[PDB]
Amino acid sequence: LTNLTPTELLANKAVDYLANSFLVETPMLGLLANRVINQKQKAIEWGAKVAQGVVGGRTRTGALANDTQGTIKGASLSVPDYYIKHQFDVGKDEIVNSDATGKISAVRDPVGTAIADAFDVLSKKINSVLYTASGVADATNYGIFGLDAAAGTTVANSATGTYAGISKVTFPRWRSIIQGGAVPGTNEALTIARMTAMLRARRTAGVTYKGNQNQRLVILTSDNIENDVLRPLYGTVVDNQNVDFTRLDKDLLPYVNYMVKGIPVVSDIDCPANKMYLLNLDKLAIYSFDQSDADQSNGKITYIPLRYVTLWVRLADVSDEHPDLLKFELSVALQLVAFDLIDSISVIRDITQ
Amino acid sequence: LTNLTPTELLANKAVDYLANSFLVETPMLGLLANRVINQKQKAIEWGAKVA
Amino acid sequence: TGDTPSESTLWVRLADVSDEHPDLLKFELSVALQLVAFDLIDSISVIRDITQ
């Protein structure tokens, strides 16, 4: 009876479930993950066409007049020199204790749980610093050039700046098509005309603009414009399908809950205040620097891949001489590479909400 | 067609030389290095018949 | 300046003086030695002043 088998001796197994109901959606990162590339070099080199050669026509026997050619330039970003650090202290005498007293499998690997919730908070921060990240590498713009600094924040910021070395002032094709209200920075209502004018300006730049062009044009939006502006406009989701109902994707469908005449809109609550990002997910990538050559004898460094529900994040035994502590550290370095900035990002910044 | 191949992207190879000729003559070290005595102890004692 | 570097017997410790930090390796190359003039009057003699 009750007095026998008391509470203290009744160690009742609990369901091996953690209830980590934090960050169900990493929209921007999830779009760019599975297409991140880790490279052994710390800088990102690529070629950006800036001008196209004018063409000319001779007769069948006309003179072979020489003709101007294009101009490509070396855009050179850099995997930055400031990690997104997350160090935590455990102690051996509670890792081993929890390997035996931990009821939940999550508690039974307290370092595993610590690194898992570290992944959650870390990819949340990554997502937050993929839009509004100055690239100054000062613990809030961790090292990433984001989307407001890859492109600009204002219409003027699309010009008057540099990105990946290429100057937006001398090369208009290196700008973005950031465009907003009639009076800038005043948050007008985003009529149908504004969105269609954005897409039309995106056509006139040679940039992918239709729903599916085998280049994955997507709309990042604050999950507020998409519901309170993009839903009343454009009506339902079925009346915004492509010309034929091509199935959306595998790596793009999870983050999309709406379409705009095709053109999947990804709703991120972490996307900044009223603003919109027509991105070209194929022309956007995230690069990371792989320090695989790290003291092979040491078992300190592991590089477990980041999960956002491949991108690696370094897990390090940052352990002092102290023999009863571990002091792990999870650090990831990313650079938001925006190939062909005229293609990769465009902004409709000046929406109400 | 020099614009289509900017120096930024054109990354040229190297002779792989590292011109490394710094003064390394160490005859003071070169003498009496073939018989550097590696003791297991920190002090070097001996006797000197002085007077 | 041309002949082989000729591995010595004065062993130099390259100590991998790392840290808990996973970004720096911080190697060290340290050596200690003493020049022991056995028979000071025999081991060294000097012609201290010479014009060049």
Side-chain angles (χ1 to χ4, degrees):
Chain A
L1 192 140
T2 62
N3 63 7
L4 311 194
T5 79
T7 61
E8 300 96 289
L9 275 297
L10 284 194
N12 49 4
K13 309 172 257 289
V15 63
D16 62 358
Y17 186 75
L18 185 52
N20 194 0
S21 67
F22 282 152
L23 163 54
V24 72
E25 282 289 271
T26 61
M28 183 66 268
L29 173 68
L31 286 159
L32 291 166
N34 310 86
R35 81 183 62 222
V36 299
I37 190 167
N38 313 285
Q39 67 176 14
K40 298 290 181 68
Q41 65 182 357
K42 175 142 91 63
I44 321 304
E45 60 86 20
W46 78 91
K49 263 213 177 175
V50 165
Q52 266 150 36
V54 165
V55 294
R58 68 182 171 86
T59 77
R60 186 84 41 163
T61 72
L64 294 187
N66 196 296
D67 213 345
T68 187
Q69 277 90 3
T71 291
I72 78 168
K73 281 195 66 178
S76 181
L77 271 179
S78 75
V79 184
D81 291 331
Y82 182 76
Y83 286 115
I84 312 178
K85 285 222 181 293
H86 181 86
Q87 55 99 25
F88 55 93
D89 292 331
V90 295
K92 309 184 62 172
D93 63 5
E94 66 89 19
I95 282 179
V96 187
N97 180 29
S98 176
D99 287 326
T101 61
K103 289 200 264 191
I104 298 89
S105 66
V107 177
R108 211 169 326 115
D109 203 359
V111 61
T113 284
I115 62 170
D117 289 331
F119 276 19
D120 291 331
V121 71
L122 194 69
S123 65
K124 182 47 155 162
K125 183 59 64 67
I126 282 159
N127 194 18
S128 88
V129 304
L130 280 188
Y131 318 82
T132 45
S134 308
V136 288
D138 59 358
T140 62
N141 305 297
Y142 295 65
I144 298 85
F145 269 98
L147 293 180
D148 293 17
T153 65
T154 69
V155 174
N157 292 174
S158 63
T160 74
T162 194
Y163 174 69
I166 309 191
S167 58
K168 299 152 162 176
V169 285
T170 61
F171 311 123
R173 199 82 187 280
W174 195 239
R175 305 209 263 257
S176 288
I177 312 98
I178 309 160
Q179 53 190 123
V183 294
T186 57
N187 291 171
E188 66 183 1
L190 185 72
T191 181
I192 193 66
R194 295 188 48 198
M195 191 84 180
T196 195
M198 181 45 238
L199 285 159
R200 273 203 307 263
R202 205 167 173 80
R203 312 184 67 166
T204 59
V207 175
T208 79
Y209 57 95
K210 195 65 183 260
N212 44 287
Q213 297 198 182
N214 294 313
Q215 203 65 350
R216 304 301 51 91
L217 168 83
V218 172
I219 309 163
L220 267 293
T221 300
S222 87
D223 214 350
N224 200 320
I225 295 90
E226 178 269 359
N227 276 332
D228 302 344
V229 178
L230 283 181
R231 288 251 157 191
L233 273 69
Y234 292 103
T236 186
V237 65
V238 66
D239 80 328
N240 288 301
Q241 298 291 340
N242 290 288
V243 181
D244 62 358
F245 303 92
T246 54
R247 198 176 303 182
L248 186 39
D249 212 343
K250 195 76 42 173
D251 48 355
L252 199 149
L253 182 43
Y255 310 110
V256 170
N257 221 327
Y258 191 67
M259 311 215 88
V260 167
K261 38 194 171 184
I263 279 176
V265 64
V266 165
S267 297
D268 194 351
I269 194 66
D270 218 353
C271 181
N274 43 9
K275 193 159 299 193
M276 202 193 294
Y277 295 146
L278 266 66
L279 314 177
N280 190 316
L281 267 298
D282 273 9
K283 298 313 280 180
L284 285 170
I286 298 182
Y287 279 57
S288 71
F289 182 75
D290 170 27
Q291 304 157 27
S292 80
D293 300 66
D295 284 319
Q296 205 47 71
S297 63
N298 261 359
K300 318 279 191 67
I301 314 300
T302 49
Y303 293 91
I304 49 170
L306 182 78
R307 272 294 78 76
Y308 36 85
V309 172
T310 185
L311 178 49
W312 301 97
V313 56
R314 172 182 79 202
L315 168 81
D317 291 331
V318 183
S319 302
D320 46 354
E321 68 278 16
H322 192 306
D324 306 331
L325 259 184
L326 277 296
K327 192 178 312 267
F328 294 99
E329 201 256 349
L330 276 178
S331 61
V332 59
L334 315 165
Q335 192 55 270
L336 180 45
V337 174
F339 310 102
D340 289 338
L341 183 63
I342 193 66
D343 195 335
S344 279
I345 298 89
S346 306
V347 186
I348 307 91
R349 56 167 282 110
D350 201 1
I351 311 160
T352 58
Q353 201 49 248
Chain B
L1 192 143
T2 50
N3 308 317
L4 277 297
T5 54
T7 183
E8 301 145 0
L9 294 174
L10 183 62
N12 63 187
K13 296 271 158 302
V15 176
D16 200 75
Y17 197 54
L18 178 62
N20 205 29
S21 61
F22 268 106
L23 182 60
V24 285
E25 310 216 339
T26 54
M28 185 66 204
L29 184 46
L31 311 165
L32 61 83
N34 304 267
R35 34 171 161 81
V36 164
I37 311 297
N38 296 289
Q39 264 168 345
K40 287 313 190 43
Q41 87 192 47
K42 206 150 51 63
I44 310 153
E45 321 206 316
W46 74 96
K49 194 159 96 192
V50 179
Chain C
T1 61
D3 56 355
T4 303
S6 86
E7 295 293 328
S8 170
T9 59
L10 173 55
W11 301 87
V12 176
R13 182 194 49 222
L14 161 71
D16 184 3
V17 187
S18 87
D19 211 12
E20 60 261 10
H21 207 266
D23 298 325
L24 311 171
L25 283 198
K26 197 138 52 162
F27 283 93
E28 201 206 30
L29 203 75
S30 51
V31 60
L33 73 164
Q34 185 70 253
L35 186 84
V36 178
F38 307 99
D39 208 346
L40 188 47
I41 196 162
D42 181 12
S43 286
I44 299 91
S45 313
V46 193
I47 306 99
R48 199 201 160 285
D49 274 333
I50 287 160
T51 197
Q52 292 312 71

